[PDB]
Amino acid sequence: LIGQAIAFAFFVAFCMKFVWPPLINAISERQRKIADGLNAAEKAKA
């Protein structure tokens, strides 16, 4: 019964510790998608 509660509390701390990195990794890709749009805009301007 004690192990149940320790597993509860302790898993969450690890997730919280690992939270900033996933978001950072996720943003770093959207910029690549942005470049195609910028190129399309430049073609339209041309």
Partner: protein
């Protein structure tokens, strides 16, 4: 390609200005020549009028 396009834009605007100059000078010259010849012929007319 966009940089090339900008260069082309200048390459067209300059020629537009040039042809503008060409046309305007041509018109000015032609008109002056016309007024010249005109009053010369009208002067012939006036002298013949006096002779009459």
């Amino acid at each position: 390609d966009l940089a090339d396009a900008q260069a082309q834009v200048k390459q067209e605007l300059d020629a537009a200005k040039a042809q503008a100059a060409q046309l305007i000078e041509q018109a000015n010259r032609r008109a002056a020549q016309l007024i010249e010849e005109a009053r010369t012929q009208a002067a012939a007319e006036g002298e013949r009028i006096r002779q009459q």
